[PDB]
Symmetry: D2
Subunit: 116 residues, 4 copies
């Protein structure tokens, strides 16, 4: 219930998610940045029996019917309930690269999600 809903990050990206009773996370992601357009499928897992924030993570491969950025982002964070529910994350964005360029394949950042 807590997790399920629409969330936006500081970049203006949109995350629509449903938390299943089995610890599954499914929804779609709409990105404000990068080489993207439209929504992308997301899938993740969360602690369906948390103690403290709720640990969760999700992935988006930046490929839909319109574009392919040949990359994937994984968000690792925790959900924090209250008046102002937030999802605090750290993410890794890996681009498919040649062996020579593999060293600079992964970006790291942090996103804060606000529930609408």
């Amino acid at each position: 219930a807590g997790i399920t809903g629409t969330w936006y990050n500081q970049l203006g990206s949109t995350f629509i998610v449903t938390a299943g009773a089995d610890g599954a996370l499914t929804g779609t992601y709409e990105s404000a940045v990068g080489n993207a357009e439209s929504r992308y499928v997301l899938t993740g897992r969360y602690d369906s029996a948390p103690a403290s924030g709720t640990a969760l993570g999700w992935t988006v491969a930046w490929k839909n019917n319109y574009r392919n950025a040949h990359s994937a982002t994984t968000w690792s964070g925790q959900y924090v309930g209250g008046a102002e529910a937030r999802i605090n994350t750290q993410w890794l964005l890996t681009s498919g690269t040649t062996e020579a360029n593999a060293w600079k394949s992964t970006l790291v950042g942090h996103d804060t999600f606000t529930k609408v």
Copy 2:
């Protein structure tokens, strides 16, 4: 096909994955370290129409029928096919923490998966 199979990291953890034609990653993860025992459900996404490496990612919430470590790991990387196929990753392990311990909620590492 290539991604689909049983993989092992340096630590001896086992990742059994099924790669869907649509870009879905589904499977089971069995760890060799941490507050864990047995297999855990994994879910991810991958680039199903790659260009050189194949971008992918997945999440495991460290909760099963036996234990709950109140944490989740996300692996972000690329599959490199060939005679000696590998999955080179970087991971974030976030524990559910109180707001006071939030600064030290996330661990970062790298794992190399092979079929051996």
Copy 3:
């Protein structure tokens, strides 16, 4: 000039730094969290001829005359001038560990520094 001064992060930690004409960073760090007390020596490097933020980084080994946490933090970020000068960073905190526990040796986070 820009970089040189007293800065505080969101945790209430204190960073006193002087930027040398040669791209050197020296000062002391006073931590609000962890197993620390008093100041610790810091050393870093910055782009003394920036274009865009100014790229910089610094390290602190958590050892002084009073305590030893057997760990080191490296902050990688950029300085951004203006009315409100800020240092936006990502950090890695590695703890000396045995080979068995090396996998969980490194924490990752992000700090924003405000100049006073």
Copy 4:
């Protein structure tokens, strides 16, 4: 003594370091990748009174007499002594960027240094 010497990462970059009794790391870094040429000054800190691995870190701003990549890398890790001494690190490479490209300013990787 142990840390002091010439080390090489997987990429073939060369790290010449001097470890001070007081916990200072000073030296030169010569890269094998990126918008770089020649040696760059490095500065860091290390635990000079370790317990098993030895925590350390260092920074290189990618500016010298020949080029300026307007970026800086920080390596955070541990020195493991013995017959086959190694320095296992994780690094953050931040480029100076405009505020619009700040989200993708930082790369993350891992380097293993040996004396061979």
